Design an enzyme around this catalytic site. Sequence first.
Site, PDB file in Angstrom:
ATOM      1  N   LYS A   1       0.859  -1.174   0.000  1.00 30.86           N
ATOM      2  CA  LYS A   1       0.000   0.000   0.000  1.00 30.86           C
ATOM      3  C   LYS A   1       0.899   1.229   0.000  1.00 30.86           C
ATOM      4  O   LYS A   1       0.875   2.045   0.926  1.00 30.86           O
ATOM      5  CB  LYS A   1      -0.883   0.005   1.247  1.00 30.86           C
ATOM      6  CG  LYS A   1      -1.783  -1.211   1.370  1.00 30.86           C
ATOM      7  CD  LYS A   1      -2.678  -1.109   2.597  1.00 30.86           C
ATOM      8  CE  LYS A   1      -3.542  -2.344   2.751  1.00 30.86           C
ATOM      9  NZ  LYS A   1      -4.333  -2.298   4.011  1.00 30.86           N
TER      10      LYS A   1
HETATM   11  O1  LIG Z   1      -1.715  -2.366   8.453  1.00 33.30           O
HETATM   12  P1  LIG Z   1      -2.796  -2.407   7.504  1.00 33.30           P
HETATM   13  O2  LIG Z   1      -2.960  -1.208   6.569  1.00 33.30           O
HETATM   14  O3  LIG Z   1      -4.121  -2.934   7.980  1.00 33.30           O
HETATM   15  O4  LIG Z   1      -2.333  -3.411   6.374  1.00 33.30           O
HETATM   16  C1  LIG Z   1      -2.318  -4.799   6.497  1.00 33.30           C
HETATM   17  C2  LIG Z   1      -3.621  -5.430   6.016  1.00 33.30           C
HETATM   18  O5  LIG Z   1      -4.042  -4.989   4.723  1.00 33.30           O
HETATM   19  C3  LIG Z   1      -4.251  -6.092   3.852  1.00 33.30           C
HETATM   20  O6  LIG Z   1      -5.649  -6.310   3.682  1.00 33.30           O
HETATM   21  P2  LIG Z   1      -6.693  -5.254   3.054  1.00 33.30           P
HETATM   22  O7  LIG Z   1      -8.019  -5.904   3.255  1.00 33.30           O
HETATM   23  O8  LIG Z   1      -6.385  -3.925   3.673  1.00 33.30           O
HETATM   24  O9  LIG Z   1      -6.354  -5.223   1.271  1.00 33.30           O
HETATM   25  P3  LIG Z   1      -7.410  -4.180   0.215  1.00 33.30           P
HETATM   26  O10 LIG Z   1      -7.258  -2.847   0.891  1.00 33.30           O
HETATM   27  O11 LIG Z   1      -6.828  -4.181  -1.154  1.00 33.30           O
HETATM   28  O12 LIG Z   1      -8.700  -4.888  -0.059  1.00 33.30           O
HETATM   29  C4  LIG Z   1      -3.490  -7.273   4.481  1.00 33.30           C
HETATM   30  O13 LIG Z   1      -4.054  -8.581   4.348  1.00 33.30           O
HETATM   31  C5  LIG Z   1      -3.455  -6.928   5.932  1.00 33.30           C
HETATM   32  O14 LIG Z   1      -4.539  -7.561   6.607  1.00 33.30           O
HETATM   33  O1  LIG Z   2       0.395  -7.201  -0.927  1.00 39.61           O
HETATM   34  C1  LIG Z   2       1.312  -7.240  -0.083  1.00 39.61           C
HETATM   35  O2  LIG Z   2       2.503  -7.509  -0.363  1.00 39.61           O
HETATM   36  C2  LIG Z   2       0.956  -6.997   1.389  1.00 39.61           C
HETATM   37  C3  LIG Z   2       1.755  -7.587   2.368  1.00 39.61           C
HETATM   38  C4  LIG Z   2       1.425  -7.475   3.716  1.00 39.61           C
HETATM   39  C5  LIG Z   2       0.289  -6.771   4.094  1.00 39.61           C
HETATM   40  C6  LIG Z   2      -0.508  -6.175   3.117  1.00 39.61           C
HETATM   41  C7  LIG Z   2      -0.175  -6.280   1.772  1.00 39.61           C
HETATM   42  C8  LIG Z   2      -1.006  -5.481   0.761  1.00 39.61           C
HETATM   43  O3  LIG Z   2      -0.419  -4.611   0.083  1.00 39.61           O
HETATM   44  O4  LIG Z   2      -2.222  -5.746   0.663  1.00 39.61           O
END
Ligand SMILES: O=P(O)(O)OC[C@H]1O[C@H](OP(=O)(O)OP(=O)(O)O)[C@H](O)[C@@H]1O
Ligand SMILES: O=C(O)c1ccccc1C(=O)O
Lengths: 270, 270, 270, 270, 270, 270
Positions: B143
Amino acid sequence: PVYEHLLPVNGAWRQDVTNWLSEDVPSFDFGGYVVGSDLKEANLYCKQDGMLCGVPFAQEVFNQCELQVEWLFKEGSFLEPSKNDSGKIVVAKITGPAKNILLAERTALNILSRSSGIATASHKIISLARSTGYKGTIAGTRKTTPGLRRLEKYSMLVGGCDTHRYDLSSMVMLKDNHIWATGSITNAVKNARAVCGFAVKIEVECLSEDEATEAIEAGADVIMLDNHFLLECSGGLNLDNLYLCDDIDIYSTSSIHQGTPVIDFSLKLA
Amino acid sequence: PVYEHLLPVNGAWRQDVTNWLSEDVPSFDFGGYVVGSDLKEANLYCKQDGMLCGVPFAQEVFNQCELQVEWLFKEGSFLEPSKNDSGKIVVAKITGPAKNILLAERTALNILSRSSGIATASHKIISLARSTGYKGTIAGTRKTTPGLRRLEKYSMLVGGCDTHRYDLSSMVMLKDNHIWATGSITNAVKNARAVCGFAVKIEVECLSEDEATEAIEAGADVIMLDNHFLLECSGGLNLDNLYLCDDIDIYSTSSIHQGTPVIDFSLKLA
Amino acid sequence: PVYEHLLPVNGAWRQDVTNWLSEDVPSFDFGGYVVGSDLKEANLYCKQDGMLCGVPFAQEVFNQCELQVEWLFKEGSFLEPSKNDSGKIVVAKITGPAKNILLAERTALNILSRSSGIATASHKIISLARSTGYKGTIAGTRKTTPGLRRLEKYSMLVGGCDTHRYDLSSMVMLKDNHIWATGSITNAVKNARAVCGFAVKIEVECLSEDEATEAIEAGADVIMLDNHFLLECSGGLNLDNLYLCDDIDIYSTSSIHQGTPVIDFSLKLA
Amino acid sequence: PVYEHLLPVNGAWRQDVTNWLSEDVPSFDFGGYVVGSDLKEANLYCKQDGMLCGVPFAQEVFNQCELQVEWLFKEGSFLEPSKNDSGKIVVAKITGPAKNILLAERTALNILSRSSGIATASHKIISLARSTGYKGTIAGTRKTTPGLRRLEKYSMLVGGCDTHRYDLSSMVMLKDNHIWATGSITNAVKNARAVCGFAVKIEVECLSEDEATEAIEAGADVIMLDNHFLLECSGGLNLDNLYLCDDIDIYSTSSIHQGTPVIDFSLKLA
Amino acid sequence: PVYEHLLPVNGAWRQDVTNWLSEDVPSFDFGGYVVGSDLKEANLYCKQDGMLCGVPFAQEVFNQCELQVEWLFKEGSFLEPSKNDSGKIVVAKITGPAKNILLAERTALNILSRSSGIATASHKIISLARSTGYKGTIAGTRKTTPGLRRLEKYSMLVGGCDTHRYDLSSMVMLKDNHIWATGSITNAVKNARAVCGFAVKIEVECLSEDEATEAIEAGADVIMLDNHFLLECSGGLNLDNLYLCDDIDIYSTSSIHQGTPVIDFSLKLA
Amino acid sequence: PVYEHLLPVNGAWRQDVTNWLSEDVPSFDFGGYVVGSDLKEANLYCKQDGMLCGVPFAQEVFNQCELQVEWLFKEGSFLEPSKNDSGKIVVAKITGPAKNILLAERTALNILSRSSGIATASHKIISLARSTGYKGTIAGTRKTTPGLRRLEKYSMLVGGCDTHRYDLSSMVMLKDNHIWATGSITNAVKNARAVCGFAVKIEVECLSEDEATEAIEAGADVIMLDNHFLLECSGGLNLDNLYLCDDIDIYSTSSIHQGTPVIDFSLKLA
Ligand SMILES: O=P(O)(O)OC[C@H]1O[C@H](OP(=O)(O)OP(=O)(O)O)[C@H](O)[C@@H]1O
Ligand SMILES: O=C(O)c1ccccc1C(=O)O
Ligand SMILES: O=P(O)(O)OC[C@H]1O[C@H](OP(=O)(O)OP(=O)(O)O)[C@H](O)[C@@H]1O
Ligand SMILES: O=P(O)(O)OC[C@H]1O[C@H](OP(=O)(O)OP(=O)(O)O)[C@H](O)[C@@H]1O
Ligand SMILES: O=P(O)(O)OC[C@H]1O[C@H](OP(=O)(O)OP(=O)(O)O)[C@H](O)[C@@H]1O
Ligand SMILES: O=P(O)(O)OC[C@H]1O[C@H](OP(=O)(O)OP(=O)(O)O)[C@H](O)[C@@H]1O
Ligand SMILES: O=P(O)(O)OC[C@H]1O[C@H](OP(=O)(O)OP(=O)(O)O)[C@H](O)[C@@H]1O
Ligand SMILES: O=C(O)c1ccccc1C(=O)O
Ligand SMILES: O=C(O)c1ccccc1C(=O)O
Ligand SMILES: O=C(O)c1ccccc1C(=O)O
Ligand SMILES: O=C(O)c1ccccc1C(=O)O
Ligand SMILES: O=C(O)c1ccccc1C(=O)O
């Protein structure tokens, strides 16, 4: 009018999108291989209270990834997933080849999250200043994210703020200026005029009633104090105290765009 | 070792810098015209407590702007301008043509401010987790800021955190996965292997003791639970509560890099 | 001040130069092979009366071709090779590898010839208007050479003319406008304000004392009639009759830049 | 046959168009925002007597701007708006989103005006030479507009002239040559052969019956005098006197392409 | 003369090199980090009998990687490491920062190995044909490696072969032609002339004494049979039988460049 | 699963295709002009026994050239035109504007021929090793064609081989290492870990039971001897002797991709 109309039907902003996809896949999408091209449906969720921004940019990601998308809200809409049982709101419905959806996912969400974060920040500060009866403008700065300036200035607009000049090639600004460096405000301002001509404004960052007047004299179009003519106050302003506006024309601050938190977004297949 | 050594002497990251200067000057620098090429000296100030990051990137801006710079601190150094009378610390001394200095100024500072902000955030969370006696790793995510991924992942490293995979072409990740979509963990993981080969790891986002085992079975190298093999916990973690680490290998979070505040920097001529 | 200071030390204008060399050598310079790298000296001749323009651009060609050049005249200088026995004037002395000199030759001269042609045209018309006691400004337009806009606007400046806005992203212009299309000057001008903010002017191409006033009303910064506020007259003006200026602020015309003859230049080795 | 068929369905010439649109909109089209996307119709007018050139190039601008265009004349057609009451002729009918039309407008017209200007100039000189009973060819040169060479050479063709070699990588030319520099015509011509091979011609700019013969000897394919083999005369020729052609094969001149006036074009919405 | 002089001092071929380094390091050189910048020395070894080709290209890699290199042999030199005890020959001595050397290593060697392989193949076939007393030319084709055409055509030259036309924009070739498609050789050849003009040759792939004559009639400059005018024989020729040359001007074959083995090269630090 | 799914719907690999077409037509397709746009049909022939590879890449050429193509075989199919009377097999049927077909022809075939050559080589060696009862993997290297790495690694996969790491930014490799240079395997491996983190493997090129163990100690994921952990043998292996595999995990060799012969392909219109 529609903000996204500010974007030329074609131009460099679209190559940017492509470049951003390349940034995510230098050589092979393994996930797409494993997932395949079967058609799937998916919901794009906003997971935090804030203003939806970046629609056309995310749309461009969806188009280059050859997907069908239907937006449930117009750009600018204020979203409040908190006042929802699930705590999330579907802002768009997407359909297309599995792999395509997952390839667009991250990049698209990185767009929305940041674009909305800024839109939201800007909106909070402009409306906050508006509530005190201030009639002037709240603007941004050039302290933007390297390479993301177009997206960020755009979000400022949607947030309801002024973007202020775009780059060094736009409104001239003769900033603190010992370095500007010799002559006068009066000859620095003359030289600037000499090159920028009539179609572009000249702003001078002054320090005294004299400074300003000398600028107003030279013909400056805007006066920056930094603690027919326009008065701008800039420097360390934020959603904080800070309510200390008065009848001065402009209040610029990076707080509406730089270092701002993001609005969480999400995407999951049916 | 020196972090900046991760950057190839030449490559696309340098064209990025150029592109960022173009982003600031599409057609004419009026300010440089008015200021001229006289040699001047300037101090680069850090204006907030935090870790200095982005040195080689800012250096690249200084080189393309043909300036002479002398850094007073090594990248990674923790700065505390607060415990200074002036409230600012000179981190670099610069000399060169006036116009050149002012042209590099904004872009360079946009680099440092953001790079340091992330370095700082990362460092706070890693050291925070380290203080509780956690021996595992704290990583980032994908992200990142569209087009700024190299700079941000780099700052994560300097901050003392793991970057986690870089892009979709690196470690495979079979994320939540109904969409992944049919067969098994076992055949999704087989297909992934089939394409990625031995030199790249495969991670599976599991949901049950079975899920995991099936993955460990298929040969997954990492197990993502998301609330010889490695265990990763991810999702909504931050410098907050949140101290709830246990003997699981990885804890990933965007909080170290996305939506983070910035470290203020400054530049003024003698 | 020095005009060439308007050009950022580094930016896209330099890649342009490179691209122009590629345009001349898609695959092999046969001539350089045959000529070799022996050091030679050469004179750059101006072969027609006119103003020298394009120096830094030609210089960039000489640098990328790794040559040593010494200019005998400053940019802007008026040259009169006619009032010379030979009918040509050496404006620069160049030294370097034979092949390098011949590779730079055409491209460099295509720069100077055109840049000077425009500089010259502009200068003739501005000085011509100045001789009648006109105190206003003579500007250009957006009818520039695709891909050469930076070079042409720059030459306008050196010619002593105003460049007028640079592109669609600069001063707004609500041109003839039936197409602009509904509401008012008053709401077209409001919308424009709404997006461009305070740092950029808005110009309206009016048709009647009312039109204008409505614009002056809405807050337009410039009024275009096309046969604290500013008045611009535009359309088919040239060095011809045509002496029919009056106290109106701006007179724009493409004649200073589009379709203009060129100033012949030349290069021969010792 | 159709000239526009010389252009590859896809290639760099199309990215050029895009780049030219970016050149006009570095950051925001304000005018499009205010105008909106309502469908409108418009007429593209030729406003001066001349030959229509640049159709496919303008078409590319119209396609990238997603518009529907119907051309009323084929490329190459000679237009005489003077022998029209209004003094203008509709050459194309366009339909599409308002903003799109106005965004394409300038760039498209900058293409046509210049392309037609050159086509027209070329045609006048070729037909002028043809009227005296000359059977040879009139060609152009490499003194083209930096970055616009493809468009200009193309217009030469439509104008009915020869383009002469395209760049330094095509037909070799051993130009005045003291600098070419030692050996002989005979070894300069041998070396050139040595590298260019059989598929590309070699031209030598000679000075005497001997010079030429030595070249014809070495195997040169063309002989340039500059005041089975081919004879070319070049240098300061124009539509002027100047009628002094004789049975020599080629007459090259930049007058058909460099420094030429433009053919005015126009665009207005219903 | 020196072959590398065919390469413009600056142009796209240098950006190619950069792009190739990026291709090897999309995000971080880990190895350079671990190795550091200490100065080291290294030997570049040729590990197989063959002709050294690609020097300037490899040199460009060494320059962008900021290293000091000293070549022990001139490009074109035939190397026979077999008739050496060690079975390897040092062709260059390199010095510079450790990381830089290792970053340049692969890319540089991928250049040399392939460039030399082709140079070697070409040389074997040309000398092989020369030994039978053939006086004509052996050329290549357009069946080159996508994106590597400049490097491959260049190696052909060094190998001592003709490159044949470079691309579709050079010598015209009316290949088998039912598809070419209607009229005549005579009108296909007229149209081609009509567009290519005098500075570029036209080749026709004929099938009968008539075919050819009709071409010689139309004015074709070369005649391709494919089993003042020139005769070319092409199709499935190789270093094999195959010695069946006769007094026909050209023999083209991809065997000198496509599908050819490589010449092994090596690099190790002191 | 489908290999071509590894390719992102959009990304840099598509600009590559465009760039390759530009490489073939820097300025004008004469052949297309003469041939015209009449619709024609054509057969794409494989002219040698081998595995069909490069389908999506060739498809991209066909799409950008706006043609309709129908493939008669799936990528990966083994073709044996020898066991055919004509000695050729139609692998695809194409329809579209004449000029378009001929413009796509060379580039497309240069793709297929090389892609299939590698696919074929890889397949021969993997199946050859598989026939002896070897259960391990056969991989490639980084000795790829500058700028063609994506296409070549992809072909390796289709050939049924492992690609091994993609670039320097993927699996770390601490190669022969005197140059790596001081400390230990143990600290070189620690530093590498320090930067690459958990998501990317580290390989060490060892020399003794100790070397390896020290690496296994430091935590290396792969052990390279070069004559939970993995063993790789590399260096001069080929389809030759050479059958000398044993229970070691990996055998890497450039023979499957570098210096390999090509599979002939062909295209002719109805
Ligand atoms: O520290 P954080 O920002 O929570 O990042 C980590 C989380 O984000 C991702 O899922 P997510 O559902 O956010 O992917 P999306 O936004 O593309 O659907 C990933 O599986 C983690 O659970
Ligand atoms: O995609 C990844 O490499 C990833 C790895 C760890 C947490 C979140 C992410 C994300 O970007 O959704
Ligand atoms: O809301 P804020 O972020 O304070 O932004 C506004 C301030 O920043 C600028 O000065 P600054 O000294 O920050 O420029 P520098 O960082 O390049 O030296 C400007 O003159 C304002 O005073
Ligand atoms: O000196 P000149 O070249 O006349 O340039 C100035 C004129 O051109 C513009 O209108 P125009 O109708 O030419 O715009 P168009 O060509 O796009 O329709 C503008 O409004 C001026 O009237
Ligand atoms: O029609 P014209 O524009 O005269 O073009 C033709 C002439 O220009 C060239 O010489 P020139 O000396 O002009 O080359 P230079 O300008 O690079 O030195 C060429 O040899 C011709 O004589
Ligand atoms: O030495 P070689 O590789 O045989 O190359 C030379 C032959 O290739 C060409 O035809 P081809 O039918 O191969 O063109 P295609 O592959 O595009 O259809 C050409 O006409 C020659 O006959
Ligand atoms: O199948 P092959 O082509 O032998 O490839 C494999 C070998 O090549 C590499 O070493 P090498 O010494 O060749 O690297 P260099 O060429 O850069 O010095 C690697 O360590 C292997 O031993
Ligand atoms: O970026 C800045 O320093 C800045 C700060 C406040 C307003 C405007 C600007 C500007 O430069 O345009
Ligand atoms: O290009 C034009 O039509 C134009 C003509 C006159 C002044 C300004 C402009 C402009 O668009 O900026
Ligand atoms: O550009 C020139 O000097 C030139 C002038 C006349 C003919 C040909 C050329 C050429 O270089 O191709
Ligand atoms: O590439 C080919 O088909 C070809 C084959 C032999 C000679 C020349 C060429 C060519 O096209 O230039
Ligand atoms: O390219 C090489 O030297 C190499 C050789 C064998 C395996 C792997 C590699 C690699 O560098 O990844």
